[PDB]
Design an enzyme around this catalytic site. Structure first.
Site, PDB file in Angstrom:
ATOM      1  N   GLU A   1       0.848  -1.184   0.000  1.00  0.00           N
ATOM      2  CA  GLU A   1       0.000   0.000   0.000  1.00  0.00           C
ATOM      3  C   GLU A   1       0.890   1.242   0.000  1.00  0.00           C
ATOM      4  O   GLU A   1       1.251   1.752   1.061  1.00  0.00           O
ATOM      5  CB  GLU A   1      -0.951  -0.047   1.210  1.00  0.00           C
ATOM      6  CG  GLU A   1      -1.608  -1.422   1.307  1.00  0.00           C
ATOM      7  CD  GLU A   1      -2.840  -1.485   2.166  1.00  0.00           C
ATOM      8  OE1 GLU A   1      -3.179  -0.510   2.863  1.00  0.00           O
ATOM      9  OE2 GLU A   1      -3.494  -2.545   2.127  1.00  0.00           O
ATOM     10  N   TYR A   2       1.258   1.724  -1.191  1.00  0.00           N
ATOM     11  CA  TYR A   2       1.009   1.192  -2.531  1.00  0.00           C
ATOM     12  C   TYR A   2       2.249   1.500  -3.377  1.00  0.00           C
ATOM     13  O   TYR A   2       2.954   2.477  -3.099  1.00  0.00           O
ATOM     14  CB  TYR A   2      -0.202   1.832  -3.219  1.00  0.00           C
ATOM     15  CG  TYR A   2      -1.403   2.018  -2.327  1.00  0.00           C
ATOM     16  CD1 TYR A   2      -1.520   3.154  -1.551  1.00  0.00           C
ATOM     17  CD2 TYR A   2      -2.404   1.051  -2.258  1.00  0.00           C
ATOM     18  CE1 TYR A   2      -2.606   3.341  -0.730  1.00  0.00           C
ATOM     19  CE2 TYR A   2      -3.492   1.230  -1.426  1.00  0.00           C
ATOM     20  CZ  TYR A   2      -3.583   2.381  -0.666  1.00  0.00           C
ATOM     21  OH  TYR A   2      -4.680   2.586   0.156  1.00  0.00           O
TER      22      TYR A   2
ATOM     23  N   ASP B   1     -13.113   1.922   2.590  1.00  0.00           N
ATOM     24  CA  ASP B   1     -12.434   3.139   3.029  1.00  0.00           C
ATOM     25  C   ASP B   1     -12.547   4.224   1.967  1.00  0.00           C
ATOM     26  O   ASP B   1     -11.654   5.055   1.821  1.00  0.00           O
ATOM     27  CB  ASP B   1     -10.962   2.908   3.363  1.00  0.00           C
ATOM     28  CG  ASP B   1     -10.772   1.882   4.458  1.00  0.00           C
ATOM     29  OD1 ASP B   1     -11.582   1.868   5.403  1.00  0.00           O
ATOM     30  OD2 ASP B   1      -9.823   1.089   4.341  1.00  0.00           O
TER      31      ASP B   1
ATOM     32  N   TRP C   1     -12.901  -8.014   4.334  1.00  0.00           N
ATOM     33  CA  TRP C   1     -12.041  -7.475   5.371  1.00  0.00           C
ATOM     34  C   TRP C   1     -12.922  -7.101   6.561  1.00  0.00           C
ATOM     35  O   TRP C   1     -13.624  -6.079   6.520  1.00  0.00           O
ATOM     36  CB  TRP C   1     -11.251  -6.245   4.902  1.00  0.00           C
ATOM     37  CG  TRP C   1     -10.274  -5.852   5.965  1.00  0.00           C
ATOM     38  CD1 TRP C   1     -10.505  -5.036   7.036  1.00  0.00           C
ATOM     39  CD2 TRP C   1      -8.929  -6.306   6.091  1.00  0.00           C
ATOM     40  NE1 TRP C   1      -9.384  -4.969   7.834  1.00  0.00           N
ATOM     41  CE2 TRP C   1      -8.397  -5.727   7.262  1.00  0.00           C
ATOM     42  CE3 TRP C   1      -8.122  -7.158   5.337  1.00  0.00           C
ATOM     43  CZ2 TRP C   1      -7.093  -5.961   7.678  1.00  0.00           C
ATOM     44  CZ3 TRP C   1      -6.832  -7.381   5.761  1.00  0.00           C
ATOM     45  CH2 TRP C   1      -6.335  -6.799   6.914  1.00  0.00           C
TER      46      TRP C   1
ATOM     47  N   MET D   1      -9.630  -3.257  -3.112  1.00  0.00           N
ATOM     48  CA  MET D   1     -10.020  -2.722  -1.811  1.00  0.00           C
ATOM     49  C   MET D   1     -11.072  -1.629  -1.998  1.00  0.00           C
ATOM     50  O   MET D   1     -10.829  -0.432  -1.845  1.00  0.00           O
ATOM     51  CB  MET D   1      -8.774  -2.232  -1.080  1.00  0.00           C
ATOM     52  CG  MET D   1      -7.830  -3.401  -0.831  1.00  0.00           C
ATOM     53  SD  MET D   1      -6.412  -2.966   0.159  1.00  0.00           S
ATOM     54  CE  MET D   1      -5.393  -2.138  -0.990  1.00  0.00           C
ATOM     55  N   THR D   2     -12.283  -2.076  -2.326  1.00  0.00           N
ATOM     56  CA  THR D   2     -13.430  -1.181  -2.514  1.00  0.00           C
ATOM     57  C   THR D   2     -14.074  -0.872  -1.160  1.00  0.00           C
ATOM     58  O   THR D   2     -15.214  -1.228  -0.869  1.00  0.00           O
ATOM     59  CB  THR D   2     -14.448  -1.784  -3.475  1.00  0.00           C
ATOM     60  OG1 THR D   2     -14.648  -3.168  -3.155  1.00  0.00           O
ATOM     61  CG2 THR D   2     -13.966  -1.688  -4.896  1.00  0.00           C
TER      62      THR D   2
HETATM   63  C1  LIG Z   1      -5.847   5.347   8.097  1.00  0.00           C
HETATM   64  C2  LIG Z   1      -6.631   4.456   7.143  1.00  0.00           C
HETATM   65  O1  LIG Z   1      -7.822   4.197   7.425  1.00  0.00           O
HETATM   66  N1  LIG Z   1      -6.095   3.902   5.957  1.00  0.00           N
HETATM   67  C3  LIG Z   1      -6.820   3.015   4.984  1.00  0.00           C
HETATM   68  C4  LIG Z   1      -6.158   1.583   5.061  1.00  0.00           C
HETATM   69  O2  LIG Z   1      -6.654   0.928   6.266  1.00  0.00           O
HETATM   70  C5  LIG Z   1      -6.637   0.628   3.900  1.00  0.00           C
HETATM   71  O3  LIG Z   1      -5.691  -0.503   3.856  1.00  0.00           O
HETATM   72  C6  LIG Z   1      -6.227  -1.865   3.761  1.00  0.00           C
HETATM   73  O4  LIG Z   1      -7.529  -1.930   4.387  1.00  0.00           O
HETATM   74  C7  LIG Z   1      -7.748  -2.416   5.718  1.00  0.00           C
HETATM   75  C8  LIG Z   1      -8.947  -1.657   6.366  1.00  0.00           C
HETATM   76  O5  LIG Z   1      -8.664  -0.259   6.359  1.00  0.00           O
HETATM   77  C9  LIG Z   1      -6.448  -2.334   6.559  1.00  0.00           C
HETATM   78  O6  LIG Z   1      -6.618  -2.871   7.896  1.00  0.00           O
HETATM   79  C10 LIG Z   1      -5.921  -2.154   8.923  1.00  0.00           C
HETATM   80  O7  LIG Z   1      -4.653  -2.820   9.081  1.00  0.00           O
HETATM   81  C11 LIG Z   1      -3.776  -2.193  10.066  1.00  0.00           C
HETATM   82  C12 LIG Z   1      -2.434  -3.036  10.091  1.00  0.00           C
HETATM   83  O8  LIG Z   1      -1.768  -2.747   8.842  1.00  0.00           O
HETATM   84  C13 LIG Z   1      -4.462  -2.248  11.468  1.00  0.00           C
HETATM   85  O9  LIG Z   1      -3.659  -1.412  12.328  1.00  0.00           O
HETATM   86  C14 LIG Z   1      -5.874  -1.590  11.399  1.00  0.00           C
HETATM   87  O10 LIG Z   1      -6.545  -1.904  12.638  1.00  0.00           O
HETATM   88  C15 LIG Z   1      -6.769  -2.254  10.297  1.00  0.00           C
HETATM   89  N2  LIG Z   1      -8.057  -1.506  10.138  1.00  0.00           N
HETATM   90  C16 LIG Z   1      -9.334  -2.134  10.073  1.00  0.00           C
HETATM   91  C17 LIG Z   1     -10.644  -1.374   9.900  1.00  0.00           C
HETATM   92  O11 LIG Z   1      -9.388  -3.385  10.166  1.00  0.00           O
HETATM   93  C18 LIG Z   1      -5.401  -3.252   5.882  1.00  0.00           C
HETATM   94  O12 LIG Z   1      -4.135  -2.990   6.532  1.00  0.00           O
HETATM   95  C19 LIG Z   1      -5.159  -2.949   4.368  1.00  0.00           C
HETATM   96  N3  LIG Z   1      -5.242  -4.261   3.598  1.00  0.00           N
HETATM   97  C20 LIG Z   1      -6.451  -4.869   3.121  1.00  0.00           C
HETATM   98  C21 LIG Z   1      -6.491  -6.194   2.317  1.00  0.00           C
HETATM   99  O13 LIG Z   1      -7.539  -4.307   3.349  1.00  0.00           O
HETATM  100  C22 LIG Z   1      -6.525   1.385   2.522  1.00  0.00           C
HETATM  101  C23 LIG Z   1      -7.245   0.519   1.400  1.00  0.00           C
HETATM  102  O14 LIG Z   1      -6.934   1.067   0.106  1.00  0.00           O
HETATM  103  O15 LIG Z   1      -7.219   2.645   2.588  1.00  0.00           O
HETATM  104  C24 LIG Z   1      -6.664   3.577   3.527  1.00  0.00           C
HETATM  105  O16 LIG Z   1      -7.523   4.697   3.440  1.00  0.00           O
END
Ligand SMILES: CC(=O)N[C@@H]1[C@@H](O)[C@H](O[C@@H]2O[C@H](CO)[C@@H](O[C@@H]3O[C@H](CO)[C@@H](O)[C@H](O)[C@H]3NC(C)=O)[C@H](O)[C@H]2NC(C)=O)[C@@H](CO)O[C@H]1O
Length: 376
Positions: A119-120, A192, A339, A189-190
């Site tokens: 990412e990313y 956030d 997710w 990742m549809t």
């Molecule tokens: C600050 C912010 O919201 N950034 C968004 C990113 O979270 C998101 O990345 C992907 O989505 C999920 C859900 O947001 C991410 O999960 C998070 O993972 C971290 C550890 O890396 C953990 O600390 C958080 O608690 C957890 N959040 C939730 C709600 O579970 C995940 O890391 C990423 N991977 C996947 C497969 O989803 C991106 C998506 O494009 O958007 C940002 O806005």
């Protein structure tokens, strides 16, 4: 259709009924389970939690109870950032070190594939050359996996990727036509798509644009994002739609202004189990809905929201999951990814909708089935 279910290795630390480990997973609900997350050291894949080895074994042992189930290990994630990926892809030597370590690591611990979750490429500090070097990494990994499958007389390890849903990040990060040739599946990742960072309320995963959204804001919906991937080089059958089993919270700047686009002051309060301001798990949402909240159906976007006083929530429920599952099937996509399964009401104690209500909804809607009886 495939139903791909992410499991997170920090859900175990949630208090009380929130604690979730691989043995809490129903092995028959999903077609694929993805373990989030592995890390990287010296350009080799590694564990991150003290008990990852224990959880790996519990996770892949689930396949002993469902002979069709496959598992993958995801590397990266949001907090991991980009610097290790940039270094690793910068040279053929570092990519070979990494690919070799992945084959050994997945075969050692019993995984069927790797999910790349950078990412990313091209953003968050990653330089512009990483858009193409990501393609090169994926190409070399697919080729190495193909060769190891034949050399070891085993089914080939899968290579997948979780990819951005924001158009700016997509354009900066991915050579979609070539990348799509080498990936087995593309986990889009549809979600956030809106959040308190924008200063106003919006839905986490709306299906369609809101009627008065203009310009780039009109990109922030599942329909546009999935069709962007599809019409810029990715085969529909490889595209997997992202389904969030959580919602985003906001503090309303003015409680009487509680619609879509209402101005906000920041994140809502952390939930008692997930303990991170800005989001709530679905089971936490159910408690909120029983605490006096008002529920509204966002008809144009096919998702719910709810509010109570100065707190506002954009989220997904059984009805929105059903509508979006119908939609992805009509559009011939490969399936759905969740997710995350540890954010569902896995105990059934919070929502009075049975165990795993959101994940079960998609299991039924996508016709997931492995038990055939050969009689009525
Ligand atoms: C600050 C912010 O919201 N950034 C968004 C990113 O979270 C998101 O990345 C992907 O989505 C999920 C859900 O947001 C991410 O999960 C998070 O993972 C971290 C550890 O890396 C953990 O600390 C958080 O608690 C957890 N959040 C939730 C709600 O579970 C995940 O890391 C990423 N991977 C996947 C497969 O989803 C991106 C998506 O494009 O958007 C940002 O806005």
């Amino acid at each position: 259709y495939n139903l791909i279910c992410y499991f997170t290795n920090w859900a175990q630390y949630r208090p009380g009924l929130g604690s979730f480990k691989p043995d809490d997973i129903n092995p028959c609900l999903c077609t694929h389970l993805i373990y989030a997350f592995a890390g990287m050291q010296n350009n080799e894949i590694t564990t991150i939690e003290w008990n990852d080895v224990t959880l790996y074994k519990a996770f892949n042992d689930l396949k002993n109870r469902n002979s069709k189930l496959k598992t993958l290990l995801a590397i990266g994630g949001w907090n991991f950032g980009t610097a290790p990926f940039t270094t690793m892809v910068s040279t053929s030597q570092n990519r070979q070190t990494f690919i070799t370590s992945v084959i050994k690591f997945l075969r050692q611990y019993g995984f069927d594939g790797l999910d790349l979750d950078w990412e990313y490429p091209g953003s968050r500090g990653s330089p512009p050359q990483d858009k193409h070097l990501f393609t090169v990494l994926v190409k070399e990994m697919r080729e190495a996996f193909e060769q190891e499958a034949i050399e070891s007389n085993r089914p080939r390890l899968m290579v997948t990727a979780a990819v951005a849903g924001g158009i700016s990040n997509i354009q900066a990060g991915y050579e979609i036509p070539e990348l799509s040739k080498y990936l087995d599946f593309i986990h889009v990742m549809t979600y956030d798509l809106h959040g308190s960072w924008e200063g106003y309320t919006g839905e986490n995963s709306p299906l369609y644009k809101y009627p008065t959204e203009t310009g780039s804001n009109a990109y922030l919906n599942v329909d546009y994002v999935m069709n962007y991937w599809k019409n810029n080089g990715a085969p529909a059958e490889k595209l997997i739609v992202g389904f969030p089993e959580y919602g985003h919270t906001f503090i309303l700047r003015n409680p009487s202004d509680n619609g879509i686009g209402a101005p906000t002051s920041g994140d809502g309060p952390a939930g008692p189990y997930t303990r991170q301001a800005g989001f709530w798990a679905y089971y936490e949402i159910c408690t909120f809905l029983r605490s006096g909240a008002t529920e509204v159906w966002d008809a144009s976007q096919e998702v719910p929201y709810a509010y109570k006083a100065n707190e506002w929530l954009g989220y997904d429920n059984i009805k929105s999951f059903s509508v979006k599952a119908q939609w992805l099937k009509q559009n011939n996509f490969g399936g759905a990814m969740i997710w995350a399964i540890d954010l569902d009401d896995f105990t059934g104690s919070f929502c009075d909708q049975g165990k795993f209500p959101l994940t079960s909804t998609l299991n039924k809607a996508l016709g997931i089935s492995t038990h055939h009886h050969h009689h009525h």
